[PDB]
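Late entry, zinc ion complex.
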Amino acid sequence: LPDLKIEKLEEGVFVHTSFEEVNGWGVVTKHGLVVLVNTDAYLIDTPFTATDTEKLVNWFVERGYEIKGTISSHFHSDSTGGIEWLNSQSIPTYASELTNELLKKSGKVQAKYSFSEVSYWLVKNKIEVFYPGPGHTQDNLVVWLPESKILFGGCFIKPHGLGNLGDANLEAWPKSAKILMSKYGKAKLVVSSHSEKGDASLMKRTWEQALKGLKESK
Ligand SMILES: C[C@@H](O)[C@@H](C(=O)O)[C@@H]1NC(C(=O)O)=C(S[C@@H]2CN[C@H](C(=O)Nc3cccc(C(=O)O)c3)C2)[C@@H]1C
Ligand SMILES: [Zn+2]
Ligand SMILES: [Zn+2]
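Prediction complete; structure with ligand written out below:
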């Protein structure tokens, strides 16, 4: 299995790639972010494992940063795998109320801090967490960095196919995808969970794949 990797994408914006074997899909590549505000670091999604999460936290602790927060974009393992470990290490975890509700019904450890607002400023003028509506899951969020104009689309951005449909809402995805396109047209870069960083066009490609998926449904 490939080692956790961390790459600077921009001043104050890092991508973290982690890997795990999932039945059927094989070795899954999961991209997350780390955002720096002054001396504070914020985790956008955790690696699959407490181990990789520990490795990620130590990387920024070693460089003089303090982890002031972590946001999970939805309730599946590839966003929440490290939450239990982060809690034990006194690092504040965030998730939407919907995400925390789904984690509870799944018997999984919940984030410590939750929020219900469609648009939540995790850090004023720096990290916005946005709920476009159901798609990949009922609770999937995206994260917007207005300074860099980077959108983290998580498992919601699916330009070449929708992937795991287990908890997907095919009827809502296209509406949610078009809502995303409406709000973040000004996006310079779109970082997704499982595909290469692209431009704003990746929001339109997701809409096309959602529409296609919905059609096969009927
Ligand atoms: C462990 C969980 O966290 C799980 C989850 O969150 O549900 C992980 N997330 C997802 C996900 O859908 O976001 C998957 S599957 C992932 C899709 N993205 C990669 C991929 O192979 N994409 C792809 C490419 C071309 C065609 C198609 C097609 O479906 O036809 C799919 C792999 C993971 C196992
Ligand atoms: Zn998922
Ligand atoms: Zn995923």
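Residues 78, 155, 193-194 surround zinc ion (ligand 3) (CB under 6 Å). Will revisit in the morning.
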